Amino acid sequence: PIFEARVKVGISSSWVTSRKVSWRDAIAQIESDRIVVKYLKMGEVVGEDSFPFSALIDLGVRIPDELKLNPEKDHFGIKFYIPGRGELLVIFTIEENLLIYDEKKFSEFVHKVFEVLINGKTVMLQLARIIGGAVNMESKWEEGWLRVIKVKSARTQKTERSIVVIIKDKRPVSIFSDLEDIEIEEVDMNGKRVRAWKIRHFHIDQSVTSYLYIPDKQTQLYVLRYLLKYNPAIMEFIMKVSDDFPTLKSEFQEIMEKEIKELEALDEMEKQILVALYSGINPLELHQFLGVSEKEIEEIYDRMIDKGLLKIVMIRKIVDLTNEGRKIVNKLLKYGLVSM
Amino acid sequence: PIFEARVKVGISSSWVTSRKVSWRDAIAQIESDRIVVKYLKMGEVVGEDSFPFSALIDLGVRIPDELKLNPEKDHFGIKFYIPGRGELLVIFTIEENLLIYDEKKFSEFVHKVFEVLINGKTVMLQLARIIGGAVNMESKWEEGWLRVIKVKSARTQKTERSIVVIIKDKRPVSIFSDLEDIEIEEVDMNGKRVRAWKIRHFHIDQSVTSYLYIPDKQTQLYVLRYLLKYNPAIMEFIMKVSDDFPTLKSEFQEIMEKEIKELEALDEMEKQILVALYSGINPLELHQFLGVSEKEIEEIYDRMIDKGLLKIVMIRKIVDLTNEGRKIVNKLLKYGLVSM
């Protein structure tokens, strides 16, 4: 097999009155066309389930806390519709004991699932169709395939996991690195009306606009899921092109509402600190604007920082003369060494 | 003997032109009229100088650092003029080898010399001749004698070594407790006009000027040395009596000049920080007035404090948003929960 992992597996049946999922001991194997789950009693195998990629509806889905086992560890849910049973949520998660479970090995296992789903899937690409607001007449549609790789440049030169477009006779195009993204319809230069993606991405030396169409609707969802998971900064751009995907409009709506409630619940004083420091008020003077003492503000600065919200750039210290410090100054005056 | 000390003794002569002092080893005896030094080699008495308390010019003289044997140990210098030979400076110190000398019987040895020289000497007192600037003519001349004791009462109520005037059938007068001092000399003293001391002192309730005439001018020098030695705070108000005591005015000149040089040696920067803080400039803003960076001012603060001149009153920390702080503040106005 491509990859294995010893793991806890829970299967939901994902229906109303979702009963508590039952977790079993198994080792999970990635094949070319399926995930096979081999269940364990002691060290032995009692049975197995095969889950075809033919039936993979969605992956990387949002796991309710009611369905989490061991909320410290990470959970990964893959949703299939197998025709006989129905729509299933298969969730994989590792357990604490270090002699059975390995987090990095599990972390690779989930990544290989994306790699198998995405690598080699077909895509048509028209590279750099505007330059400086003028449409490139040398820009032709190219056929190619997706490849999940680490793209090491940005315009920032920060290495980031992404998906590139492999094209015949030219090295891959880093179509998801440095973005803006809208979605448009297009007359294919060969002739089809296509439901394609318009990407304003920072290309080789200049901001550019290229058109990208992924025929398989499923692999589009796969691509979006992975770009979210391993690069959460992008959550903005793709949410603009996220409407075609009901499972995402839902989850984005759900997280938005939780974020609202979380921000409501935050301490009003601490929210005030963040906005004032963000706007540019001197931290040494901030207590003066918010109507609070030096002692109390520094204590609140201590409660932040613990929360990871603030960082110390520098410690200033309020100092005063000792009796020996005064002895010097009074000597200087007595001998006519200072004016006052 | 009244008291003895085995010490390391060094003698300097105005007759010997070379500045050298050789530290012989001896026992030295306090007598009624003299101090006798039986010199000691291999624990055996090879020589003996007898130093009368008559022709004891001065004691507690300031010792040049050129003449100090062991700069840790105390050096007590007693100066005699022996007419056949000249002016002698006998310097007393110890090596405080823990079984041949000891520190604490040394520090008392010097004090007992003052006690022997001062106790019982005739003195004459006109107590509280001025109250509020008004002449008290119930204040008469009383004759008595001096005594070396610790006088508790001051305005700080803190005990201090001092000298009192004993009068028959009256408690002692603590004439050197809380003081200012001029020399008037015109007072008649129930007879011939004679040079006396005008002493402003707090006494019981009120700023009071009393007159004190110590007939023996050598005894006068001894009480002044004693007060200077064991209450060096008393130095001020004395120097108006630095006239008529030349060796005292010389030592005052040399101290102040050595102080002004020391002050000029201090860092120019640190002195201005000391004066500015003494004036009342905010320590957080002081770097601004001196045209210095915050990093350097806090560095200089740390070099001070160590030297004992400054003390931290409060710790203020300049604080900045983290990446997580920005996420929250970005989300707040992203959802319009904060107005900027």
Numbering used by the authors:
A (entry chain A), B (entry chain B): 2 to 341
From the paper:
Binding of CheY-P to CheF induces a rotational switch of the archaellum. CheF forms a twisted homodimer offering two CheY-P binding sites within an elongated C-terminal tail domain.
However, we could successfully use the dataset deposited by Paithankar and coworkers, to solve the structure of the P. horikoshii at 2.75 Å by molecular replacement (MR) using our initial MjCheF model and obtained a complete model of CheF. CheF consists of two N-terminal domains and a long C-terminal tail that reaches out from the center of the two domains and extends into a long tail domain of over ~80 Å in length. The first N-terminal domain is formed by seven β-strands (i.e., β1-β7) and an α-helix and connecting it to the second domain. This second N-terminal domain consists of eight β-strands (i.e., β8-β15) and is connected to a small helical bundle (i.e., α2-α4) central to the two N-terminal domains. The asymmetric unit contained two CheF molecules, which interacted through their C-termini employing a buried surface area of 2700 A2. The strongest determinant of this interface is a substantial β-sheet, jointly being formed by the β16 strands of each of the CheF monomers. Moreover, both monomers of the CheF homodimer do not align symmetrically to each other but instead tilt their N-terminal domains by 90°. The residues involved in bending are E265 to L267 within helix α8 (obtained from DynDom47). This observation suggests that the CheF homodimer exhibits an intrinsic flexibility with respect to its N-terminal domains, which might be of functional relevance. Thus, our crystal structure suggests a CheF homodimer, which was confirmed in solution by mass photometry (MP).
